[PDB]
Amino acid sequence: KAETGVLNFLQKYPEYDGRDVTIAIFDSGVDPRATGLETLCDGKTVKVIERYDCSGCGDVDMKKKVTPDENGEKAVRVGLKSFSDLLPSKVRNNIVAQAKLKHWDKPHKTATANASRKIVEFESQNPGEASKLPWDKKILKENLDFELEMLNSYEKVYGDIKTSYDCILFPTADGWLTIVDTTEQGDLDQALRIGEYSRTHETRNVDDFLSISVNVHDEGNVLEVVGMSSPHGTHVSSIASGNHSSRDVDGVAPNAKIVSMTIGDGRLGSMETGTALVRAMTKVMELCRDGRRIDVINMSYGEHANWSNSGRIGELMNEVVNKYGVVWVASAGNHGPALCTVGTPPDISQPSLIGVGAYVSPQMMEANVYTWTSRDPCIDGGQGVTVCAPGLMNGTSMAAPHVAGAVALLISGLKQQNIEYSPYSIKRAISVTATKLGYVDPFAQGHGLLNVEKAFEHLTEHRQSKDNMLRFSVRVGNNADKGIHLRQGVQRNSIDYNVYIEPIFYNDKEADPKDKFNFNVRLNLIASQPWVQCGAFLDLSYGTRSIAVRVDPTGLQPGVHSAVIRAYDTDCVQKGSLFEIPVTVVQPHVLESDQNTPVFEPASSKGDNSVEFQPNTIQRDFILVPERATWAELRMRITDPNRGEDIGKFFVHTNQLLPKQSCRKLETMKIVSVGSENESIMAFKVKSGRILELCIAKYWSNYGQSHLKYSLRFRGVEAHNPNAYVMHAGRGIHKLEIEALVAEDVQPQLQLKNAEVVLKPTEAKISPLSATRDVIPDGRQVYQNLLAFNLNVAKAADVSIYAPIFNDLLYEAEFESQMWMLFDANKALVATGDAHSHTSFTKLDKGEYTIRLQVRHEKRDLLEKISEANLVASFKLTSPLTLDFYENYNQCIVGGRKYVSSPLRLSTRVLYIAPITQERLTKANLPAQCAWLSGNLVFPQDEVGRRVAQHPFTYILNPAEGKANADDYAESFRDFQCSQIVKCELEMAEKIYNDVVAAHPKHLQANLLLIQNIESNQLKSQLPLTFVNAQKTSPPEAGESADKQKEDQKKVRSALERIVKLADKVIQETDSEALLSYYGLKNDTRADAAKIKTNMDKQKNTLIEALSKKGIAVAKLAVLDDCIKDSLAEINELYTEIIKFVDANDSKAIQFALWHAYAHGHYGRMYKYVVKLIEEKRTRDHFVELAAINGALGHEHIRTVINRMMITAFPSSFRLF
């Protein structure tokens, strides 16, 4: 719809519906089944011919082959008779969740139809006593309280459970058949049986509200699932194409064929990845080379860059446009209004992409999420916006799609009228044809609005011109910029520029028939305005030619001024301009700085200034910031009388451009509410000697014409000494030489909020990737450099992970990849990041993690330069360390009188910060091994100036670090023996042990050691229920052998229980319990003869282990005899004697309690225990036991969930890249 503004009349070439042409949709994926993309106008042919997920997010590792010896993953296997070409006999298998192929904003997919049986919660209450102290039912209330907690705990956790399915595929003749276990249970042939989408099983199969497609690579080593779930990608294709057969809701070219290519990575959910794009272009390139040309691409997608002159992703774009003649359409961006805000796509290393601004016709008056189109100065100087149309996820306001479809229409007849064209001749044709809209912001568009039928005229005519196959490379001033952009800068002098203009033959200069050497290129150049000057003639016939141009800013009054140098073919001057040289000058207001703070007020007309706003008005004042200015204050109020107390809403976009930095590094975008009554005030950070743009637009008003009265006041105060903001803990006292701008109440505050540690690469393997997928034509194999890292959390905290050398750059980077994945100790996935990850904080539990970093490129010897690249882990500190300031050095070194707040006018004030004391550091519980602490240093007292005028601060840490007797030999020999008896064959140890005890009777430790051995050679370490459940069935072996193996267990626990009693009797606890709790007298009167805990705490640490090991042993026996009931007495008297010492939750006894709890039927307590263990260790065994606990409780909705965690939390392999 809305299709009329650009054309509805070229359709009077009705046979130009989009025939013989296929568009490429780089986006969040599309949905074929959706009404409109079902078929092309043929009413029969399928439109969405292909669809990939180039991010690698949908990969599955089908590496494990297993023959269907089912008869003749994780759970079971059942599926044959389906030996349909399953040659040669085998099958591949893997596991994969799909919570990522799905936009993370669909957790509602988690519906509790049969999950809310938790609600039946039995809170057994207390008709007993009044306060906390009953004996001995305190355990009962514990057990009960703990069940309720457990239930609630699972309630809080439900939505976090991701489910992973089983995948199967084998090589039939019809291609490849893949099976997804929908019905997890019945492995029957009643599940998803999808075929290769490409090989024409181009059909969606569903789980529910989640359609799936499939591709196969690496000879069947990888499965690629494709997720439709992402609206953006669909509507984009619905505007470009969309056969509805009515020219009312139809796309712009219903006959055009679409190929969805998800370039968003679900793991980043859902950002673009260098890799993704590289793969997308790779495919395109491949398809073109192989007869199936794709003629147009459409990117409603993209971010910003820190430069244009460099980048691999960009340089590849210039190859898919120059070599494969693909017309690449991309949205200018949704980052308006403040100009110089065009983001990458299309701001790359050359004007090879068609940027499309977006405009809303007055025909559409309408009222968080608005987004102005980005304006086209372009920060290189060049021009990003090529045209406009009605309308990471560049919304596009979906008009890029429009244009894309429009470009399809032109290429319909351009090819069936047999017209030789280029991606240049097309972008060139549309440009010098469009209608400049005098009611739309000059910068927001570029060559006004697309006019198709007129642009086709241009192409039909001049079709016999060689200019159509020529590109004109325009690069400025040795940096190869694509435009002249004066914005430093107080432009009072004129300046000269050396522009290099070079002709480039469409593809390249290769014989047959190209390139017809020396295509005599003579052209003239006309300046758009008087203040720009250059020659009027230039001959390019013999290659690259330089040309000087002079800009005279002297006459230009403050504000932005634009101009262009159009060039024409001397001969046919009617071909319109061939190319343009974009000049754009910014003349800043200067603010005198002497009496009080510098202030900017718009010029006053007829008394009061008060700028007038309308639904269109965009006021952009360019101001050169005063030196010493740290922040700014924006005051504004609505003038025009009455209006009452109603509020107006204005959009403020501040934007400063810093040396080789993206526009997003000093920018603010705040929707400010303004009233007539009192003055509104917003503040923003500011940089001294550089131009600042104060762009103000009108959001929504309740009106349609207001009058704003505003001003900018400049304030500032900071440290001028060289290396302030960075302080080394071992370089003595730190100083800050503070100078303020015309008086400021100075009152500094420094809070070190998070501690960062450096992770060095353990390994750096460079490996070739796939020869099937990752190979850019022709013969360019893409290699990966895999860097491994070890992170180690000791105490749970919010942690961010980033790679300094790669972070900050997405496009415009030398390498086409970053992406790190934080892995669990169990190979699970904990987190995953890319560019700009320093901001994302994944909260980690204690334990050892792994991090993998993958860097892609085609030149191996460049990946080698990356092999030492480190990572950084920023731990959020619970307690932000606050640093004090001092005004007198000597007062600082001793830490006496602190600094006292006071005003500071035109002088220099020196403050000091003394190194942080050692005690305050260990109490900060820093990570290992911390490198530095970081925070923000604030100067001004003004509270609002504090929230904005923040200076990155860093505090770096300094590095860490008798002639033996036959008696002595006796002690040395026992220890040598004891150290052995634990690691030997228990039949050898029983001997050794005997010799030890005979020689050293009182040496009880020998008992415990034999135990550890006996219980390591004979019986598996398993928890209560897991032990019980594992004492039944399992018939694979012998029905007889099942006794000799379980009678070996009995003998052992018997032998084990007696070994404990030996360390229980001759260690009488009664008296041993007169020093620990009966301590009182610190160090026992400091007699320094018994001030040795080493002996006492030893006699007890040995005791607890004896009691502990005994109980857990006399409990297993009870289970073997099935009589925990008529044995429960001992377990109790035994458990009640341990607690008298270190409590049950200590490693020492933690899992004798688990048995006690079991024997008492306290399934609640068991949970409370098996979580303690799950906090330190986390083993599958913990979960299977935590599952069994539920089964015994009855909750099988819970246990069904626990069985899902496991499947995913303990994968077979690390997730692919």
Next chain:
Amino acid sequence: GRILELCIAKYWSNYGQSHLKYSLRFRGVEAHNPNAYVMHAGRGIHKLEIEALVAEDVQPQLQLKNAEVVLKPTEAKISPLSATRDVIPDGRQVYQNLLAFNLNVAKAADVSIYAPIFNDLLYEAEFESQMWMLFDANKALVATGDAHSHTSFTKLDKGEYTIRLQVRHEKRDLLEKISEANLVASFKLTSPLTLDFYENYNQCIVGGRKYVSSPLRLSTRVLYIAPITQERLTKANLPAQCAWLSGNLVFPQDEVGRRVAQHPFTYILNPAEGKANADDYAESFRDFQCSQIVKCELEMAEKI
């Protein structure tokens, strides 16, 4: 932005009345970005936002000349001194806080030793004492410094040294604030590490095309320095345990402007870090025995 005094006098002339024709020309070019002149080895690629004063041929050079290590106080004993000598009337006993340190030279090199918090101040300091004495492994005296010792370089042979630091004052509870005071040892590096510059970031990360000298007028030029490779560091034979390297960063090409327009630069380093058989028992038992026969009474060892 500060006043400069150009004072000119007459030394000796052969005459008694001359006429001087002189002028001062001001030049300049340096990095304006905040924490330049200080680069952490693990914070990725370093950048320098260079702005020159009315045109200067810019050609930077950075030589890391000496590696400094941090010495923490092993002990910090506060002790009363003499009641006969060190007592300021009337009844003010002067106490000393004695800080002990361990320095450890592995390879002979010129070394300077200084106490950051005390160095730089002689008078006008809160405490009335510094003075550190470097002692031999044999208790001999190797060196001894005070305020402004960061400049004196005592050449040390390999071996373990001791350093004592004495801080005097009459208020004990003020000496306690000093108890954590560290020292610094600057090892002169035989081979000054020379760092390369790049004009294009991407060219820097891969270490290709280096920066090419050129004039710079009224604009901003951004250069980059990539972290030093691990190999080039161990071949620099750094001390243990080095904290940072230091040197001087130069901007202008003018050779005379280089000898004078020096900027203190610092490069901080990142932190470092089966069921035995009766046969197996036999091997384990010999080793246990052998380990003994050396430390026993030789009459017992001859048996073993």
